[PDB]
Structure 1
Amino acid sequence: MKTMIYPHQYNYIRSVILRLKNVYKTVNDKETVKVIQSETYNDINEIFGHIDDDIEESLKVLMNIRLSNKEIEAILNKFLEYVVPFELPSPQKLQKVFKKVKKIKIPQFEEYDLKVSSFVGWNELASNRKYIIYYDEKKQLKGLYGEISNQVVKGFCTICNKESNVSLFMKKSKTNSDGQYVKKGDYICRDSIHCNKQLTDINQFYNFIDKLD
């Protein structure tokens, strides 16, 4: 209840964990495995507020110099019950965010999804447009939408910064004096839940938004 970790922090923890199951496959040096293991141990607990009771039990599982593929799915599954999910709003106070769009509606969203999501984005292919909602540095509904091209292509996403299936996302800004508005944007993961899954640091995303305004 007060050991509350964030979705982006969870993905970080996942990414460093899956890094360790790879040093049991790629790296030969005995001395390197030592510091790597130690390096990630300090990271995990530092991300928490305080290390609880079932945090000892959990860090234990990783100790072994050889982990397994069924070993990771909890730890990880066990880790998931520590995350604050994304706060999905009601269409009324969502209509206030996109005050101009005609009573727009939200899609699926399993629990697992809101547990990994720093922002939430869905595509409205009818109007070739990606809607994005997020909270910002003081828990509040901030929302945008832009023109998402209908081309998908391999390439790095300028939000999660990982090679993905990207489509150019273009928001309509405003230039010098009124009535003059040029389009700004870049390539981002077409599917935003995937983007989120690999969104390791929430600022990456903030930086992208501050690129658009």
Structure 2
Amino acid sequence: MKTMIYPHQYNYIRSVILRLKNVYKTVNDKETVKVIQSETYNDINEIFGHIDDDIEESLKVLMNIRLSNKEIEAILNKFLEYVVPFELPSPQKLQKVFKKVKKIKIPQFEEYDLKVSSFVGWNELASNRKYIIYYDEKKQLKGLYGEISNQVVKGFCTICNKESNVSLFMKKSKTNSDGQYVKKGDYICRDSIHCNKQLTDINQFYNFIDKL
């Protein structure tokens, strides 16, 4: 069967392929190139774990210094097939997850987006919140809504660890009888889809959730 890889893994594969290729573009020493070729080849193999003939063919094209961006795209498209898409919950199930928010509305998510979505997040302007649904290490769907800043600033996003247009996201603790509550949050990309594509490690997102 075709290898199954997580979306964050595919993003890493894309990044390493671009990194691997950029070496061919810049590095003039074959020796240095070779060292990186092996490193990247191993990394791609490691993610797949087992490499089929189709992966091997792609790897062969990747190893060649005459690799082209058009060829890279084709290789990525093949690798995209190996990726497994994020499972959308049933609309009923979603409402069960967001019990507090009655009649929660979900926008249509692109299948490709789902395929590359480590987590799914959607922003409602009326809410002024970002609704994030994701499967944890336990693989239970976890849904959380927190206030998203209307102001957008350029800074490193906590989730993806990449510099992008970020808006502060705050998650409120359950209100006590006194009415006291604690909000903990960090700057994150306003666009979840962009952040998903940027994210190469599932753990980084998990860490952000831990901070909340």
TM-score when normalising by structure 2: 0.94
CA distance in 1, matches of 2:8, 2:156: 19
Question: Which one is further off, 178-187 or 87-96?
Answer: 178-187
Q: Report the Cα offset of residue 89 of structure 1.
A: 1.1
1:133-144 equivalent positions in 2, closer than 5 A: 133-144=133-144
**Where does the alignment leave 5 or more consecutive residues of structure 1 unmatched?**
none
Kindly indicate whether the alpha-carbon contact (under 8 Å) linking 1:130 and 1:147 is maintained by their aligned counterparts in 2. Answer: yes
Query: What is the Cα-based RMSD across aligned positions, in Å?
Result: 1.7
Secondary structure of the corresponding residue to residue 147 of structure 1: strand
1:6-27 alpha-carbon deviations (Å, 9 max, x no partner)? 1010000000001122112232
Q: Which has the higher helix share?
A: 2
Identity among equivalent positions (%) equals 100
Count of equivalent residues: 212
Per-residue CA deviation, residues 44-102 of structure 1 (Å, 9 max, x unaligned), is: 11112422232221211112113211111110001111011000111100001110112
| Contact preservation (8 Å) 1:91, 1:103 | no
Kept in 2: contact 1:4–1:49 (CA 8 A)? no
Deviation (angstroms), 1:176 = 8.9
TM-score where L is the length of structure 1:
0.94
Identify the range of structure 1 (106-115 vs 139-148) with the bigger mean alpha-carbon deviation.
106-115
Task: Using the TM superposition, name which of 101-110 and 183-192 deviates more.
Answer: 101-110
Which segment drifts farther, 135-144 or 166-175? Answer: 166-175
Unaligned runs of 5+ in 2: none
Partner of 1:179: helix, strand, or coil?
A: coil
SS of 2:199's partner is coil
Q: Is the Cα contact below 8 Å between 2:2 and 2:82 reproduced in 1?
A: no
How far residue 178 of structure 1 moved from its aligned partner, in angstroms, is 6.1
1:160-212 per-residue CA deviation (whole Å, 9 max, x = no partner) reads: 00001100000102599863212110100000011010111100000000001
Residue 107 of structure 1: CA displacement? 1.2
Partner of residue 209, structure 2: 209
